[PDB]
Amino acid sequence: DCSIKNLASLFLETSPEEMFAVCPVPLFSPERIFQRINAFMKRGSSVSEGTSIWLRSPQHVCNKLLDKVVSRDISSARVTDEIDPKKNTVYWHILASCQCISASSAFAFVATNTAIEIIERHIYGISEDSLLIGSLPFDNPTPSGLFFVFDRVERKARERRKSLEVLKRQWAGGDLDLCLLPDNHPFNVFRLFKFDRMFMARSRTEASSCGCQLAILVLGDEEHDIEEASKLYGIEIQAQQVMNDAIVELKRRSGLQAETREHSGPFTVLQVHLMTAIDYKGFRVVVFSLPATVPRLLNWPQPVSSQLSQELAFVEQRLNLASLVKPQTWKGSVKNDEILMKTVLLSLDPSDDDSVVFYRLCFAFPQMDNAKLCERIRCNA
Amino acid sequence: KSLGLMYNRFAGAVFRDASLREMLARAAKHLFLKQMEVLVRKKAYRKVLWVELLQTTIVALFNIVLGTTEETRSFWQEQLLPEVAEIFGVDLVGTVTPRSVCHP
């Protein structure tokens, strides 16, 4: 069990006691939610025959769990003598929002799992096999993964790699294959600077057949230093949280309006974009969510009556601002020089354009100054 | 366009601020057309979307003519009132500080 098990009684005069008598205070254990969030997987529609990837990817999954949070709302919710499930009871909705944040946190644990193995297997591992002492001649090789000793040390090294494999298994995924993603991929819309390094990471385990976490390692761009390239991703992460707060209001109000009015197309094309920054040993190895198809930049000259222009006007009037995305026209190709100073519309979907995400919102808040581009006015300010 | 001569000869207050209101209404009409000249010169209708560009110029003009902020008093004394002198022919720059006809 270890669950609430039908939150009933609670009649407003019960006691200060009888609250701590029938409840846990992990009210939902982190086993019950994860044995029904794998239902949010195999029950789903549009799975064709067996082939899902983008549907089961955590980018899409946390969005549909958000579309289940917005569904049947608070004002008509009822507690107490509502033992029948599948109705608008608060026990259902606290169960539903706990699925939403568990989808975000499961992305976060896989985030820090992928994070450590990028920076150790390709950067800090060629110089970790030896070279503890710098008074001895320190000759560390350059990282090419990015583009006879005594018997006692040898046997304790075999003990080291065998025991660290136990660390790499169990809690973490049971080892993972890597891809290097050379500097011509159209995933460069995820990329800001020319000297950044991309790393797809599959599961290489039984998993839930999802895998697909790509990461970007910050290194700089010529006169932009490595601290500059890292910190601009940092203000990017802290800025997407605020638009994530404006956008979950867009799910809420458009869902509330479309439910109550039409109980007598898609839900919203401004879906929530999930990221995680790390700050391990010396680098920030920020991880995105991998799309099944290529990201294409959307031109902002758009129909007035279209969906994307319509509910961007709601997100805008909440943020107390003006036009975020400038008028852009995107024929094809890239430039890779003079890094893009404007926010863009990524449109991550194999299907019709009913799921877009925002990116480069760091270049929407001004450069502040009094001119270095890490120093910005704060997004919440 | 000869309302400026009436403003000098009007003695009563209701006729004075009515002519003054008419000249300032025609003034913001002329500065809206002057800014519209800039937006047709700089060929912006090819890049920025047209009708909302018209709307954001209108709400910028109304917030800068009617206002309780310092940008309103600076915009009046520098652009609106000197343009009143050229099209209505009276030099009223310096005596019609914006808390005189600020009413709706």
Partner: peptide, 27 residues
């Protein structure tokens, strides 16, 4: 919906000021 807001057309047509309807009321 967000394409018609604000502006309305001011039309200044050519009612002739010599018709019998205007001339009777003016005089």
């Amino acid at each position: 919906l967000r394409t018609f807001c604000g502006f309305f057309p001011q039309v200044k047509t050519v009612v002739p000021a010599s018709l019998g309807i205007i001339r009777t009321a003016q005089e």
